[PDB]
């Protein structure tokens, strides 16, 4: 029973089966992926990686089921169920790529627009690659798990159904609300990284997650079983929501932070043709096509940033120069922000077209210089949706032009006007 | 005038000249060097890098000199003096290598026992390379610094004198040299930051309040010298600082697994030294062990070198790579025992390479290649701290808390370990070391 | 099991027996007695009363005894021992009168030099009156107390003994008498709370972390006896506590105007003592100064007696009312000087009344332009590391003034000058230090 | 220039003119009026009075106006303006009666439903009484004020117009926004008592009023000059609002605290008839009619609670027993809560009727007991409006009855159903 010190949760005790999963290359992989990606280039305290976060969510996942299990013995929550929820909590973010959400959120859409990719999909794949590669299934049975049934359960908690769930019966419906909760969005994943991002960012956390946990109970709501709170900690709920809004307003939506993630992304796009990651059977993969083979994906982390930066290969100069602009702090320039009214949602696959769309708008009054689409970055921020535009040219005569193309682009697409 | 948010110090304000120094390849480099080295492999929260620590030290150096200047205008502390103290604070750890203290503490001594090397030396070398490569001296003058002897001052604040031995400032401003790196108490803003910072990442309660000390600190005469002295009501705070220091060392820095992993990473670098090429100045190519000789190569040497080995396909690198994979699967070297050299003078860096052979020479037989000998130092003080009362303000005025030598074995079977245990016990006896309990 | 939110201690949980004691006239009385008395007329944040102080002392006493018991079961601390220690913390300041230390420190001495009175005594009389008035003893037994023995124990924790002088507990449990009121070192939970609390209302930084001290406290043997001892790393915390204590005393408790105002209020009470009637037990009627003789009357004696005077229409009370109106217009007595009785026998409470005659009777000559009677003087008498055992956790079970101020009622320049001379001369005649 | 130590604002420097105003019976009165009234009987840390709050507001009022003038000298802000803004902050709550809002919010409505009264009216009446009784007008001129013009100015800041303002021209309209601002309800009164109540109640305060003051600007908005904050301060505003909601939910709307405030009020109503307060010319007044003469009102503070509690007169027995109930903690019992629907308000003039309305409701399924109007307490809590009903009879057969009468009163009056 390894016990781990954590700056947020204090002591974390880990059941030997978890320890067994943790000590594999496919997991240790997470020590090398910053939680806030390029946020670190705005918040120096944000040095933390997915690894310690994943331990925390797995740890809280355990705490929540055992607390429910003790206060409501009728729910018939077993030894087996607890371990499976911890494992879902531990591996929920296994599928992350370099710089977290930058990777599945922007890069893969821009690099391979055909492809439907989510990091959850990856997490289920990585988890399979892990237990197969490290003979975890024998260990699973030693501690009372049924590989055929429980592995399905674990995967379902992560990605959803592949009554649509075959991993557990409908009477244990409340469990699927524990690691990842789609429709109210209150799950142990958020509790952990709210507290953790706050701790590293120096932002105040008003939410007390453990009082939330032992006032937590299972109740019947519309004849399907969900996790509910007793109502005088409604005061606690609003504190969580305020903590959420602050992290978004102060950190996740930060204007420089997001620019930098789009610069790291631009660098990656310029290096994809040239960088090789070795996957299974010696085959070589691109940064963008490593999602196709997990042996390669295991080797794809935040390190790819430095591999570009330190490279001498002349083929990599254009990428290397973009990363060097970040080091010297000559960043892309902020042009403006807009929103999609009314119900139009920009879809990931239309990301690649947008810089052409803006550049092709006819802004007249026309002025001295005309900008190609290569001069524009269009950034799509989702929770609402924000659309921000940055210009790569820093002439103030180009920057003026970029603003005109933009104000009219919003117009031609019926977006809010850039206040 | 940029302002940075810090989880430890809150908002940090930076002079434009500082931002200029910060926004260079030679400084941002520190974003890619872990502060606690292999500690990250025992304390998952210890994810922090040399970068945020250097900002903190720069900030604190600023806070203290500004505090002194405003309450004692007679000391003649200039705006020029403050900037030089901040810049010294900012760049003091520029010279660190992959995994900080691991690099100059164990790797360089084991790879090149020949060599003169401390990271403080490097910081100076790197500091020179930085201001030269990025045209800083014009910007220094632009803000009123005199490059030729202010740069000397900064370097002297970092590494010490290159009598009154300092050329950077006259003896009447001697107390400034106590701010960033103070060796005769070891009480300086560098320690303050990383006590506060390591605790925050490790979950150890820090009982020293550095902000209170800075608010009561004054310059007073002591033995014909000007020193920074503390108000006498801050003595309780000093005892807390020494216990926090003591907790950090017992609980984290001297962690047994933590150090084993430090020696495993080190063993891997050595097996990779012959084969890894780092591109330096003039296109010359360098090794991990020789990158310290040219700063243009050294800028490209960070923690990344770990993952370059870990991910490599080159068969030359299998030996180094297999050790790192061993760290990943958590098959670490096994702990055999601990001893101290007390009574006699302590082990020096230049004989580190010899220690495994010495152990092998004291059922199954083990050669030196399977032994790891690890030497843990605290520094390779309350009576050196001056107080002042408030009645005559420019006057100086049981219950408190080394070298450790540990040996690890690479063979993990139950009888190699037993033999290994006895090779150790006999090596301890033979060299007059304490007997392993 | 009631839980109360507190700005210093967070949530305070209260055992039902305590709640029964709290919810009585004799206890709720403490809501109407300011802790710092006239200090409030100098520190506007200091609005707090003895009631919240008492909850905290009760809460801390509990924390400490609970903490010790769980870490050293060999001490054999019962649930019953904990309740009695808590009840003692709760009722230790039950005996305070109007404006706290003002009442027993200056008013009763000036009014009845005759009489021996301390509020600790009163806390005991009031405590008896409480549990008898509200039928607490049946409730005590319901929760496992033995009233005759445990009430003696609680009383002894408050006022001290009424060889091993305590009847309430055996010497193997001696360390319990150190928690609420600690005789010779003055380190008790009473001080811990009011240091924290006074700091909090006054805006003075408190550097003592009482939560750390309680978490490392152990009972260890010292000189044949069991005493409460601290870990060796908490010596740093102790020095902070002693400084926080000295800062509170020098900045607030000894504040010059604050004290001048306490003596103005006292003067007013003295001028109103003859004419105010407090209805005691059995319709018997009492004065402010004699209400201490009956607890039923004393329950009705709080800070309110100030506004009763101030708001009065009665002409017998005009003399008193005017002094209190002076406080409102801030025409206060003027500070003339301060002195100390260094190496001299110190002034006793029985001699307080005489002192202003003594000062007016000094002949300061150089003779001055005006002569001042004794009624024109106020003379104020203000009274204020070895003691602590430490332990090594390798070896866990064994150890390792008076101020005299004078104020003049005539303001101031010719009165104030004259006053300084009478005073400097009084110091000489009395061998007190020369006024700075 | 007296300097005062304060737990919230630290050191407060006070101009001699202000010191001249404070040192009067009519101001010092506020030392005897609890800020959270009956709240103290639930939150023991809440021992603080109207006096320290008023100093605080006066201090903040000064800091804000001094700030605007030095960052925007075109605004023409004189020292004379600063002193008038300080005096308005200081005397804005001069008009409070026993237990603050309890007096004008509930007691005076129940005792004299016919009548005008608000404490803001009282503050102006008391301020006038203050300066006349203490020869304040000469000191005003000595430090440069024009009494006829400036006394009007101060009064308007407190109570509003008696362009509607006679005290200052519209080009200085922004000054009327500082002490009491009802357009947005964001004024320095609120900053103080938010911070102060947080400090005494032990509720965490997220608003930094200091950062707000040095980003505050005077700017033109829609024809008029109003006070605005930097766009980087929008996060701080949300913090102020969370701090506010936390206080309302956790303290000001506390169920027992509000119950006790109505018990005290009942105690006053039962004592009104027999207690005499001596006003000007020896004329005698009631607690409810002391608001008519400022000499009597000055001597009307929280002391009236203890005057009843300690009384022997048999006329006062019934009142005294209600207070003794508070001492023993035998309180009214909580029956239920409801809201009005429509944008309809219950008005102060109608408070007196509500207990009769509840008792006359025909609730049934008939009951074991019949309840009189005297057995009901109807409490109206304003921010929305909450309506609570308490019963003075504590047996469960009455308490059951009371609940039926209440739910039925809600029905025929179309309030929401009490859950
Ligand atoms: N220059 C620089 N700023 C950093 C760094 N690390 C964290 N920060 C902080 C400081 C800034 O508040 C924020 C980014 O500021 P920027 O310099 O990128 O843009 P900003 O608009 O604040 O300044 P500007 O007017 O464009 O020169 O992140 C760093 O390594 N270098
Ligand atoms: N296996 C593993 N341990 C970790 C990790 N991170 C932090 N730790 C902590 C947990 C323990 O407190 C400490 C010891 O881990 P070890 O694998 O070295 O276990 P240890 O040698 O103490 O016991 P064992 O060899 O299993 O009997 O390091 C991690 O990522 N993987
Ligand atoms: N005047 C006055 N001062 C107060 C009040 N409340 C708290 N304080 C503070 C301000 C001062 O720091 C101290 C009282 O000073 P005083 O005005 O009573 O006498 P002080 O000797 O400071 O000045 P003075 O003799 O008039 O020159 O307590 C108050 O209500 N009125
Ligand atoms: N009995 C009592 N409670 C107090 C006192 N002071 C503060 N409190 C706290 C305890 C509670 O959290 C809150 C109100 O408690 P109450 O006993 O008066 O009503 P509640 O319905 O919450 O409790 P109950 O149903 O009677 O057990 O105020 C006090 O002086 N006496
Ligand atoms: Fe996650
Ligand atoms: Fe350092
Ligand atoms: Fe006490
Ligand atoms: Fe107010």
Residue numbers in the entry:
A (entry chain D), D (entry chain B): 115 to 276, 285 to 505, 547 to 582
B (entry chain C): 115 to 276, 284 to 483, 490 to 507, 514 to 530, 539 to 542, 547 to 582
C (entry chain A): 115 to 276, 284 to 505, 515 to 530, 547 to 582
Task: Provide passages from the article that reported this PDB entry.
To ascertain if a differential preference for G-based nucleotides in the allosteric site exists, two further structures were determined, one with dGTP included in the crystallisation of an active site mutant SAMHD1(115–583, R164A) and the other with GTP and the nucleotide analogue inhibitor 2′,3′-didehydro-2′,3′-dideoxythymidine (d4T) included in the crystallisation of a SAMHD1(115–626) construct. The SAMHD1(115–583, R164A) structure has the same asymmetric conformation observed in the SAMHD1(115–583)-ddGTP structure and has dGTP bound at the AL1 allosteric site. Nucleotides are absent from the active site likely as a result of the introduction of the R164A substrate binding mutation. The electron density that nucleotides were built into is presented in S6 Fig. The G base in all three structures makes the same hydrogen bonds with D137, Q142 and R145 of one monomer along with a stacking interaction with R451' of the opposing monomer. The basic side chains of K116 and R451' also make equivalent electrostatic interactions with the triphosphate of the bound nucleotide illustrating that the binding mode for each of the guanine nucleotides is broadly conserved.
